[PDB]
């Protein structure tokens, strides 16, 4: 029944959106070029500050549009009719027994009614050593209609009829198949779902589900018929596993809350979390065949939903606890994969910007064009010849992060967001080279970091050389040296306070 949707006047809105994007890009290019003519190395604080206020205004706009959406969703009330079925589809590939059993218990203890909740688990097994997942699934429920199948091959080379009847007729289904990656199991589950249900939730084998999460997703999805997909707030089950774990948790909270609420205010959520997401079965079936043959991401499914003409939402009342990598360069590989998926799709959504609000185009344009401008500004400032320039660049970056953390603290109401300032160091060393390598691609991850470190150290050395070339005995350098020393001691004290409060909040 559902089909692709277009606005009332596709040509007018398309032209308006492309004109707006082109004008925004040209305006940004004008100011940076205007900045080079208007000011040189003479006024770095003016050169940087203007940009800092730009980011700050963007952050305030996002925060306002997120707070408005949060207040609207909190004030609005709608009792659940409990007349819509929900099918929870879970993927398995050699999962740890404890995490899997926790996920199964969480899925079996949802507040949703038993008669309206189907459960399907698809495993990349087909071997004897994967039978423990099926055994655990059988022992966990043991009470409802349990149907387990082993199979001898995936859907793309009879077991197909058995799988379909077991999924569509029983409540708890456990289907194993030949290993084909996380896309094969999701495709098999979606194909076997058919028309049995109308709402399908996607989950992985390592998440813990809250009791009211499914109820809240059903409530928000039943409010309007134009919604096609919805997500929830995903927390971290191990915030103190490592240093990167707490930073990942803080970044997850900030990203989810601010960005997803701001996008839900315009119904243009770009990405829906894989562990916590719900989709319409009628819409999902239409794009299912197309999605499998694309040359199984959560950003790709959301992009397909957006391209189908329907809008996606996000509610903070639905909560779940996922996990994040704790060993180094693994978070880096995950970030590189995320950047590739983001870029291969920044390319997808560049086609149907007119189908949603102009906020989608604005955010895409700024996210595509800012990192390059930041990199160019950093390179220009470091490759100047004065320690003043690089020192004040670092100071201004840390100041920007400090106001960002303060704003996050004010928004959340908790003072733990002040610790997010280390994200600046995290991004300035690992995230930019990873993004560049991901762009160029379309151990391995250690090369971009080494290249970035080498170029940064070369720039610092060149600046130091050019600074010591001039004699400092002249009376025009004493004030510069005093200012540099005061700035350096302030930076050292700020970093010491940051680390001290980090250790106090972590150890206790």
């Amino acid at each position: 029944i559902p089909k692709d949707l277009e606005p009332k006047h596709p040509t007018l809105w398309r032209i308006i959106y492309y004109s707006f994007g082109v004008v925004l890009l040209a305006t940004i290019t004008a100011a940076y070029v205007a900045e080079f003519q208007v000011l040189k190395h003479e006024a770095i604080l003016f050169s940087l500050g203007l940009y800092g206020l730009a980011m700050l205004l963007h952050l305030m706009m996002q925060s306002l549009f997120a707070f408005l959406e949060i207040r609207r969703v909190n004030k609005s009330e709608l009792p659940c009719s409990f007349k819509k079925t929900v099918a929870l589809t879970i993927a398995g590939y050699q999962e740890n027994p404890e995490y899997l059993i926790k996920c199964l218990e969480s899925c079996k203890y949802v507040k949703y009614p038993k008669d309206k909740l189907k459960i399907i688990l698809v495993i990349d097994g087909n071997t004897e050593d994967d039978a423990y997942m099926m055994e655990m699934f059988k022992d966990v429920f043991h009470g409802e209609d349990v149907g387990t199948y082993v199979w001898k091959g995936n859907y793309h080379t009879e077991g197909i009829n058995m799988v379909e009847e077991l999924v569509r007729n029983k409540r708890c289904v456990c289907i194993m198949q030949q290993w084909g990656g996380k896309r094969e199991v999701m495709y098999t589950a979606f194909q076997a779902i058919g028309t049995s249900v109308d709402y399908v939730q996607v989950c992985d084998s390592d998440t813990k589900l809250d009791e009211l999460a499914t109820v809240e997703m059903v409530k928000v999805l039943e409010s309007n018929d134009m919604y096609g997909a919805v997500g929830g707030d995903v927390r971290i089950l191990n915030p103190y596993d490592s240093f990167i774990s707490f930073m990942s948790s803080l970044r997850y909270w900030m990203a989810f809350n601010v960005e997803r609420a701001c996008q839900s205010y315009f119904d243009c959520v770009s990405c829906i979390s894989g562990p916590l997401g719900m989709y319409r079965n009628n819409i999902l079936q239409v794009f299912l065949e197309a999605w499998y043959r694309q040359k199984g991401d959560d950003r790709h499914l959301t992009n397909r939903v957006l391209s189908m003409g329907y809008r996606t939402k996000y509610t903070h009342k639905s909560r779940a606890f996922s996990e994040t990598p704790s060993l180094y360069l693994r978070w880096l590989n995950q970030q590189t994969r995320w950047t590739k998926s983001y870029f291969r799709e920044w390319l997808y959504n560049a086609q149907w910007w007119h189908k949603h609000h102009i906020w989608m185009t604005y955010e895409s344009v700024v996210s595509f064009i800012f990192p390059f401008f930041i990199t160019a500004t950093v390179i220009r400032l470091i490759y100047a010849g004065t320690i003043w320039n690089v020192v004040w660049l670092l100071l201004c970056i840390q100041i920007m992060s400090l106001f960002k953390s303060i704003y996050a603290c004010w928004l959340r109401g908790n003072f733990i967001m002040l610790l997010m300032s280390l994200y600046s160091m995290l991004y300035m060393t690992g995230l930019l080279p990873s993004k560049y390598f991901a762009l160029l691609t379309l151990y391995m991850p250690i090369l971009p970091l080494s290249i970035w470190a080498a170029v940064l150290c070369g720039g610092v050395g060149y600046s130091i050389y050019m600074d010591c070339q001039n004699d400092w005995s002249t009376p025009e350098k004493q004030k510069e040296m005093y200012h540099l020393l005061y700035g350096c001691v302030g930076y050292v004290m700020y970093w010491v306070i940051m680390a001290v409060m980090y250790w106090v909040w972590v150890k206790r």
Partner: antibody
Amino acid sequence: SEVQLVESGGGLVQPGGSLRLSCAASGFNVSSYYIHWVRQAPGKGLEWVASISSSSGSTSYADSVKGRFTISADTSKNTAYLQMNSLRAEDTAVYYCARSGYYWGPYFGGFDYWGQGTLVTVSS
Amino acid sequence: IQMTQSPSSLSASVGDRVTITCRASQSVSSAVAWYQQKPGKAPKLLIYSASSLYSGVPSRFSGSRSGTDFTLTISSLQPEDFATYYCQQSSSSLITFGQGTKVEIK
């Protein structure tokens, strides 16, 4: 394997009286399965009376059954009860308690594991 | 809201393919099941969800649908096949049963 349903409470009652049939299940829990009551009049086909899904509160009754019959389930005793009051002449039949799965979409699963009925005689 | 089992009677010899057809007024979101009942015993389920076959049933009962009509076919009339066949449309808050369709012998 061992799933069974045994119902009792049938008997001879005066017209306009009350009755309480009870079907107890063995080998499974009634909380994860639907329970339905089917009545077969002598010399006629099966007729549906009521259906209940415990742990959810979803109860349904027929058009000619509504207003006089009540259906309930008790998980502690694992027994489904059907109470009838103000019975009429056209109520003497054999009542079956049968289990089934969930409805979902267009796939149900049918009425599996039926039980041998009991005779009800509403006459004077 | 009502159903009609068209044959309502049948009399065929052994090894003869028989077909029982059932017409339902509405089949939007409801499943059709075919049961078999012998005199003095409770009905036994044969084919679920229109075409799916129940476990233990011999591979001679075929269920099919053609829109508003549902057909149950027996390729060969085995000696343990003469009973009453019932067609039921199962749905929430409304369950209807068929009538008649007794297969005799000749």
